[PDB]
Design a protein around this nucleic acid. Sequence first.
DNA 1: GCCGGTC
DNA 2: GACCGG
DNA 3: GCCGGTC
DNA 4: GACCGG
Lengths: 257, 256
Amino acid sequence: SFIKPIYQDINSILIGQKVKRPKSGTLSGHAAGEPFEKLVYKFLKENLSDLTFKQYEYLNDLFMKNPAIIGHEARYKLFNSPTLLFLLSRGKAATENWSIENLFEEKQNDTADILLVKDQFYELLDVKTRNISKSAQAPNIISAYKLAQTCAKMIDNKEFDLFDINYLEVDWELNGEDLVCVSTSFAELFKSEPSELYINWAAAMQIQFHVRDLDQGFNGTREEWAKSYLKHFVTQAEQRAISMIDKFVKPFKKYIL
Amino acid sequence: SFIKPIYQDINSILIGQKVKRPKSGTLSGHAAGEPFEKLVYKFLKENLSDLTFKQYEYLNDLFMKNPAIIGHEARYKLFNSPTLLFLLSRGKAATENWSIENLFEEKQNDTADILLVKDQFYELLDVKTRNISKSAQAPNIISAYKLAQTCAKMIDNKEFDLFDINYLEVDWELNGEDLVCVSTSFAELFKSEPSELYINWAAAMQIQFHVRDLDQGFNGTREEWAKSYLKHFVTQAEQRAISMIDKFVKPFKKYI
DNA sequence: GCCGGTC
DNA sequence: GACCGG
DNA sequence: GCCGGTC
DNA sequence: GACCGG
């Protein structure tokens, strides 16, 4: 983590800062603590000025920096890695269509919130904003499927030392008119026990967990994580297939005439 | 529908309205352009003051005009419909601890955006906003599971004419700084083919479709719709069960 | 006191 | 809540 | 058209 | 994206 060494420097500048309320609307989804994210980001951009990127912002550089490369075919070679490509790419049309006059913008599917790159190594930083003024279910963290596929690309292409998935939790509450932050937590994904990882099928098959509570007790290799998690995925997958007939079939097969 | 009769008047008032972009940043997800839903409530509230309600506003009004009744126990009995209950009611401890000094507020998963009750008949209206500047996928309309459980209750209790589930799609486009409505569409769920509905199992098991695309040529009866939806549901389920294995298992086993 | 459904 | 297609 | 993952 | 319990 390029952010870990300065986690403190970040935790401080955040806790206690007062931002305006989210358009005075539903503090839900992509509107909860938006401001904080831009906050954490601007911070890094000032501190880690040369390592800090925003997924798309990053892509636009990768391409702009290689002006002579046109056509999705060659541009996809600008990644120099299947796995990494899988996680940051934009699709045939979008890629082929790219241009200095048709720059990439923010997309809802974008994997990471912030990209920190240095020495052929990438840190995919994703922030989770929690309305601490209550106690809710575990937030969608990332796709179990996109995770499973990512692992497979890892094993195959054998890129066990390329990227890192880290989560920065930003707890905020509504103190008066502003949206103040009260706490912050950090955690590495591949530093967690994959067999523990909870996969909520309905919840967009996303694995869910509060950064704060995320277990960081894993002492194996990244190649071992990929392999173990992938096994975890398969079992739970089958398992859900079973629970799906019980819950969504049996009790209704009685109304089916 | 109580809206239907005046939809054309609504379409006129909604089309042309503008709303300032949230933080001017990324306008997508939950809060993408949903602030339009308010404009619907606002308008609906002025033209239909006595029917227009907010799910919570309706619940609070229900409890407010029954002071003699307290405790979740008796409170849930005020609905007089196991179905409406399941669809509208709030949580037990939430119902228990209710009072003017502590009213119901906006919950993220309330079944409806607007309630227009009238004469024991309920029309649970939902507003759906779309960024017309693109060809996005159909949005989540409502859980297939919740819909299923609702279809099962209509049966068991014979409530085949108590409520309705309609949808109002409101299309917009960015006009520089604020978003501006450019169209609208109204569709009833129970008037569509209970079997052609597409169940997106990954997306909260939601039923997805662009309101403008949904049909309205169901000539059968509510009881039939229900019986047919369940059949459709119970089948898709089995499918997803199979498919899930071929897409999330088969291709990965070569790694354990 | 884990578990997971819904906008 | 509502998003396009490496 | 049809299908369906993912913030 | 992020929400609790009819």
